[PDB]
Amino acid sequence: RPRCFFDIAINNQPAGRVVFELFSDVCPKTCENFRCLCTGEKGTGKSTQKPLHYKSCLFHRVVKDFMVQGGDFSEGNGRGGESIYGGFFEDESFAVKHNAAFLLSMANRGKDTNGSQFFITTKPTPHLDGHHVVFGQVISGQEVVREIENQKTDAASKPFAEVRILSCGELIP
């Protein structure tokens, strides 16, 4: 199973590192996308014409007691983003349930619209089962996730403080 990392800053101050395990045995295509977005290895987005890379990306949406969402690398606000395959891809698995905090899952714009955007649950969110593909889990940095969850937000649930991925990649064992 792949491991990836985010080094998070909050208003340019390091908050620490979040490490994910990717369930590549369950949703390999979903996992490969996220993996490559962390490394930036696939280069330029096809429609977006911007790096397929989470580096400098924002957690643009935060909802206390629900989840924290980021990965919109091209717009920083939910409108943008693109998968490593060109555009979006198909929902691959509903096997992993949204039954805990700290699950990594694909944000989307309805059926079969998986791009670069992701969310980290902060409570059990079982109503998202069948609508979003769970593909990973936080293994360390849970306290950083809580710190993000607790940001004061604006009218669109966008943090007033910039919550930015300063560095990212894959942990090669």
Residue numbers in the entry: 7 to 179
Quoted from the paper:
Cyclophilins are peptidyl-prolyl isomerases (PPIases: EC 5.2.1.8) and are characterized by their ability to catalyze the interconversion of cis and trans isomers of proline. In order to understand the molecular basis of these results, we sought structural coverage of the entire human cyclophilin enzymatic class. We determined crystal structures of seven human PPIase domains—PPIC, PPIE, PPIG, PPWD1, PPIL2, NKTR, and SDCCAG-10. All cyclophilins share a common fold architecture consisting of eight antiparallel β sheets and two α-helices that pack against the sheets. The active site of the cyclophilin family includes the invariant catalytic arginine (Arg55) and a highly conserved mixture of hydrophobic, aromatic, and polar residues including Phe60, Met61, Gln63, Ala101, Phe113, Trp121, Leu122, and His126.
In addition, binding of CsA or derivatives was seen for PPIF, PPIG, PPIH, and NKTR. In the case of PPIG and PPIH, this explains previous data describing cyclosporin binding to the tri-snRNP complex that contains PPIH and verifies the finding from a homolog that PPIG is capable of binding cyclosporin. Additionally, the NMR-based assay does not require substrates to contain chemical modifications, and can be used to measure effects of amino acid substitutions at regions distal to the target proline not measurable by other methods. We detected binding and turnover for at least one of the tetrapeptide substrates tested for PPIA, PPIB, PPIC, PPID, PPIE, PPIF, PPIG, PPIH, PPIL1, PPWD1, and NKTR. For instance, the residue that is at position 103 in PPIA varies from alanine in about half of the cyclophilin isoforms to a serine in PPIE, PPIH, and PPIL2; an arginine in PPIG and NKTR; lysine in PPIL6; asparagine in PPIL3 and PPIL4; and glutamine in RANBP2. The division between “deleted” β1-β2 loops and “full-length” β1-β2 loops follows a phylogram distribution of PPIase domains, with the more conserved isoforms relative to PPIA (PPIB, PPIC, PPID, PPIE, PPIF, PPIG, PPIH, PPIL6, NKTR, and RanBP2) encoding full-length loops and the more divergent members by sequence (PPIL1, PPIL2, PPIL3, PPIL4, SDCCAG-10, and PPWD1) encoding deleted β1-β2 loops. There are three distinct classes of conformations adopted by this loop: the PPIA α1-β3 loop family, which includes PPIA, PPIB, PPIC, PPIE, and PPIF; a shorter version of the loop represented by the structures of PPIL1, PPIL2, PPIL3, PPIL4, SDCCAG-10, and PPWD1; and a longer version found in PPID, PPIG, PPIH, PPIL6, and NKTR.
